[PDB]
């Protein structure tokens, strides 16, 4: 609790500054501190939390993929180079897992349980699915299955709520469906499920665009284009 002495509002202010400065590790630390104040988060604050951690873990994931590729090449008439590639991949991996565990911990203590509105609850459950998905990307042990199931379960709970409580064009509903489709294709070895989910999501959103303002239209169509990009890649 290094942020325990800082006002909630000052933490949020500094998170916004950190975002402007592209200091995402600081941003994440400020937002962790804000969460640990124990109050629920507004929509803007939820997005600050998400942006911060997604940028941190995104950098870690990219680094992990670089190192994993080098390691795989080392294991092909490749000359023995000793333990260093594996050691350093493991270092990065452990740090990535630590960040995922930190986010999951915030969600479990106590963001999800206090989230009663569909917008908040879906947002947090989507986050939960995403960070388990990131853990699944690097998992190989006796627990890859359990990690995959944890991701699936979170995504599924989010989906069920989103379908009941949000319009098909809601950006969080769309983003959830996008990420769950990625889970199906990339993690769960279920490309047909991925394709179906992306197609159904896109089509139901298309049919609801007429209800939207110009600005909401822009928000929804941005994510719809991502669904389309994946469908184009996958088919």
């Amino acid at each position: 609790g290094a942020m325990g002495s800082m006002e909630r509002a000052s933490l949020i202010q500094k998170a916004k500054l950190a975002e402007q400065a592209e200091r995402y590790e600081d941003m994440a630390a400020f937002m962790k501190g804000a969460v640990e104040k124990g109050e629920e988060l507004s929509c803007e604050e939820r997005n600050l939390l998400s942006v911060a951690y997604k940028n941190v873990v995104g950098g870690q994931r990219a680094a992990w993929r670089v190192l994993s590729s080098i390691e795989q090449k080392s294991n092909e008439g490749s000359e023995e180079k000793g333990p260093e590639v594996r050691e350093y991949r493991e270092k990065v991996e452990t740090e990535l897992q630590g960040v995922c565990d930190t986010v999951l911990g915030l969600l479990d203590s106590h963001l999800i349980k206090e989230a009663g509105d569909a917008e908040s609850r879906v947002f947090y459950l989507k986050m939960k699915g995403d960070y388990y998905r990131y853990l699944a990307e690097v998992a190989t042990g006796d627990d890859k299955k359990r990690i995959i199931d944890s991701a699936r379960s979170a995504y599924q709970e989010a989906m069920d709520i989103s379908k009941k409580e949000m319009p098909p064009t809601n950006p969080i509903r769309l983003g959830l469906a996008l990420n769950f489709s990625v889970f199906h294709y990339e993690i769960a070895n279920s490309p047909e499920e991925a394709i179906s989910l992306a197609k159904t999501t896109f089509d139901e959103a298309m049919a609801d665009l007429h209800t939207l303002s110009e600005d909401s239209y822009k928000d929804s169509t941005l994510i719809m284009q991502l669904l389309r990009d994946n469908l184009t890649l996958w088919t």
């Binding site: 942006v51 983003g175 996008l178 990420n179 990625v182 941005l222 994510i223 991502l226 994946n230």
Partner: peptide, 9 residues
């Protein structure tokens, strides 16, 4: 080529 997930903004 990797699938696209949600943007971070």
């Amino acid at each position: 080529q990797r699938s696209t997930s949600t943007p971070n903004v």
